[PDB]
């Protein structure tokens, strides 16, 4: 069936291209990052800005929201994943730790919990840190190209990363070795997300197609593409059901895809520039979307 | 709603500071540095090297990413600055290939490239002394002749090297973005003014396009 969503809110205040956006665990708070150098916490319900966090480096590529909501993370060309404390007794937001140690730019950061964050970098390796001391407890080498995205399983026992080598690797969080090899893309993989079951993930590559990989088969379960769409995917997200797949293309409009029918069923054309980030709430009642236009849009 | 009004007041306090920070950064022009090793990238003028400078009360913020797909992040910069060693003929073709990748990049189709053919002194002496012959790497140099003190032989070679890159530039630019070649040395202090004048014309070509004069 067709899907139509009507930009219930418009989040204005970013003055540069937005690059990443993560929902809070309460499905109401939202952190977004832009090349402006600001990491803004949004009240989705009222479009209020809770915090505005000045970033040391404006070349940010990823943002994260701590599942507890106490901390957010930012990373990019500065080669460092910074951690910010949102519950400071002094009332301001301040950096708690800086996770230096990556040899390339960081493309994705995701908190497993407090004192444990996993980051991916362009140096072809991912690293699992602890924020208490700031030391890489594990490293996940095995990619031959820059790693672009991360997706943590619902149980946070495994995470999946995609790299420019057109391959996606699942990793054992607690043991450190790659457990699965997925390939088939004809160009860079640019966005990765987990199907809510946790036994599958969707890849979005610059070859202008999305594809669904099941950890139990590693085969081409479904291919989401069409002849009239000839541009890559910048972000990929899943709805709470898993039947709806959303992807932010460079044609300036997100496309909603039926994950099982493999046919497009909607479009979220409301941006004047490349859609960069895209994520669905934990509640499933909202769908934020950021783009280089410098506005986020809540779609329902 | 009493607390909501104090939150809505806070958001406007945040928005006021956000706007006041944007107006400061709007007047400062971003520049990206690219080039192969052994070029004068760091001399002709954080995890990634920065360099700010201001000419004629206009501020420039110049970037050099030591640590390409991060190139996408530098979309909507004022101008890319590409530095290449014109003296090393053997690596010149490799630099020529690099300039092709940058010029026809999907996300740089509107970004003008300011090309510096650096270390022109080393090019002059290399062919002035006749120690090495350019025609080994570029057979077409035997057919080229200069259209324009300066020794005739070095000038003939000097303009041939530029012609290779400008031919690469004009083959696909179509006027959306323009390459601005230059010759400079490690001692040339005017390299900063070349970027300033070139950015004025890059801005002008943007006003002409967006005001329907073009």
């Amino acid at each position, epitope marked *: 069936g067709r899907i139509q969503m009507r930009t219930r809110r418009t989040l204005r205040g970013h003055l540069a291209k937005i690059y990443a956006m993560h929902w809070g665990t309460d499905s*109401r*708070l939202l952190v977004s990052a832009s090349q402006d150098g600001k990491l803004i916490i949004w*009240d989705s319900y009222t479009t*209020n800005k*809770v*915090h505005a966090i000045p970033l040391r480096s404006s070349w940010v590529m990823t943002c994260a929201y701590a599942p507890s*909501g106490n901390y957010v993370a930012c990373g990019g060309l500065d080669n460092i994943c910074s951690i910010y404390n949102l*519950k400071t*007794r*002094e*009332g*301001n937001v301040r950096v708690s730790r800086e996770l230096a140690g990556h040899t390339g730019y960081l493309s994705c950061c995701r908190f497993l919990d407090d004192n444990q964050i996993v980051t991916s970098s362009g140096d072809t390796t991912c690293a699992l840190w602890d924020i208490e001391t700031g030391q890489q407890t594990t490293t996940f080498t095995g990619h031959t190209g820059d790693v672009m995205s991360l997706s943590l399983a619902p149980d946070t026992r495994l995470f999946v990363s995609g790299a420019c080598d057109a391959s996606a690797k699942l990793w054992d969080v607690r043991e450190g070795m790659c457990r699965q090899t997925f390939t088939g893309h004809e160009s860079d993989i640019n966005a990765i997300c987990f199907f809510p079951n946790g036994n599958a993930f969707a890849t979005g590559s610059d070859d202008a197609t999305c594809r669904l990989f099941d950890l139990r088969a590693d085969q081409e379960l479904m291919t989401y593409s069409h002849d009239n769409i000839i541009c890559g995917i910048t972000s990929v997200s899943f709805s709470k059901s898993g039947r709806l797949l959303l992807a932010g293309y460079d044609d300036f409009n997100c496309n909603v895809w039926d994950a099982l029918k493999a046919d497009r069923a909607g479009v979220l054309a409301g941006h004047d520039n490349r859609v960069s980030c895209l994520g669905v709430t934990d509640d499933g009642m909202a769908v934020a979307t950021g783009s280089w236009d410098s506005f986020l849009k809540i779609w329902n | *709603s*009493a*607390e*909501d*009004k*104090a*939150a809505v*007041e*806070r958001s406007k*306090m945040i928005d006021r500071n956000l706007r006041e920070d944007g107006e400061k950064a709007r007047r400062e022009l971003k520049l990206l540095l690219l080039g192969t090793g052994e070029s004068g990238k760091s001399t002709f003028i954080t995890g990634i090297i920065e360099y700010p400078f201001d000419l004629q009360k206009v501020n420039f913020h110049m970037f050099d990413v030591g640590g390409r797909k991060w190139i996408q992040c530098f979309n909507d910069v004022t101008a890319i600055i590409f530095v290449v060693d014109s003296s090393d003929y053997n690596r010149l073709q490799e630099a020529l290939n690099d300039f092709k990748s940058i010029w026809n990049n999907r996300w740089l189709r509107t970004i003008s490239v300011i090309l510096f053919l650096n270390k022109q002194d080393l090019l002059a002496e290399k062919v002035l002394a006749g120690k090495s012959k350019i025609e080994d790497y570029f057979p077409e140099f035997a057919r080229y002749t200069t259209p324009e003190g300066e020794d005739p032989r070095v000038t003939r070679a000097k303009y041939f090297i530029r012609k290779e890159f400008v031919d690469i530039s004009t083959a696909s630019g179509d006027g959306r973005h323009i390459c601005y070649p230059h010759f400079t040395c490690a001692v040339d202090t005017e390299n900063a003014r070349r970027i300033f004048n070139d950015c004025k014309d890059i801005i002008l070509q943007m006003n002409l396009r967006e005001y329907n004069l073009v």
Partner: single-chain antibody
Amino acid sequence: DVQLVESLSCSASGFAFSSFGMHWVRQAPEKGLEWVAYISSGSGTIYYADTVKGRFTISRDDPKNTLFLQMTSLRSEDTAMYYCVRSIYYYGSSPFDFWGQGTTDIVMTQATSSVPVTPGESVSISCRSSKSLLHSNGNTYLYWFLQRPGQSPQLLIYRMSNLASGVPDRFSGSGSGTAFTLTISRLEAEDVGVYYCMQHLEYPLTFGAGTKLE
């Protein structure tokens, strides 16, 4: 850590004073509490109690992190202990978090004046209001404070159910609409004091009478 010292003027240290809206709350020798005034972040909005409206003035100057209160004409009604209280309003914030040491319309009442308590008990406190604090947001703008003898009040519960930071799990507020309760499981020696309830739906911020536990 966080400090608010008074002598009227209030000196702030150890927190981002500019980001907190400030209150003044006064206490006659024994008559409960009364919200003297209120100033928001950036001095955008100012409120006063009906008893001092226009007669008192509240001013705040961020750079030196100091809060002021001035009296146009003193009366015998104003002899009281004056408190400096901070408050910050955003989505999940807890207003009325920290109180100073002190310097020497909705109606809410308490059905209890004083009760004896012993350790290990599960005493509960009660309060009443003249209007439904449950807003359409789903929030209920009720607050709880504990004023131990010789000590300033300290926040226990904000919005009737949320446990304040640095307060043990023992305290647990509850209620719905107009009827409210505050449970103290495993009563301990340091829990003896006067308990005040407050509303924040509309100004002035009317306090309760005060239940003195013994």
